Ligand SMILES: *SCC1=CC(C)(C)N(O)C1(C)C
C-alpha cells in the first residue's frame with residue numbers, strides 16, 4: 235500500500251465527467267473540475283486540464299496523469315503551509331499518507347483549519363486525535379472514507395485498506 239493505491243481506493247476511477255460526493259463535477263481519480271453547477275464550465279476546465287478538446291471523456295492514462303499532478307499538488311500544498319508542514323514533518327510515512335489523503339479531498343486550507351486535531355497529531359496522541367477528527371463535517375458527510383483515514387492515523391498501519 236502507498237498514497238497512490240490508497241487514494242485510488244478512496245476516490246475510484248471514472249473516465250467521464252461525474253459528480254462527486256458533494257455534487258461537484260469531477261473526473262478520473264477524484265480530480266475536482268469545478269464547484270460550478272454548469273456542466274459546460276466543467277467541460278471547459280477539463281479541456282484546459284488535459285490540453286485538448288475532450289468530449290467530457292478522458293483515457294485512463296490521462297486520468298492517471300491528473301492523479302499524479304494532484305497527489306504532487308497535495309504534498310506541495312502541505313509543505314508550503316505553515317500549519318500543515320510541522321505536522322507532516324512530525325509523522326511517520328503511513329500517517330503522512332493519511333494527511334495527504336485529507337488534503338487531496340478537502341484542500342490545503344480546509345485541513346489547515348483542523349487546529350485541534352493537528353495539535354493532537356503532532357503530540358502523537360493517536361486515540362484522542364481520532365476522536366477529535368470524527369467531530370467534523372468531513373466525518374459526517376463521508377464516514378466510511380473518514381473512518382479509514384482516521385484508523386490510519388490511529389494505528390499507523392494500513393489495516394483499514396487491506
Ligand atoms: S480504527 C483501526 C482499527 C484497528 C483494529 C483494532 C484492528 N480495529 O478493529 C479497528 C478497525 C478499530
Ligand SMILES: [Cl-]
Nearest residue numbers: 245246254264
Ligand atoms: Cl470520487
Ligand SMILES: [Cl-]
Nearest residue numbers: 368369370371
Ligand atoms: Cl461534530
Ligand SMILES: [Cl-]
Nearest residue numbers: 376377378379
Ligand atoms: Cl464515505
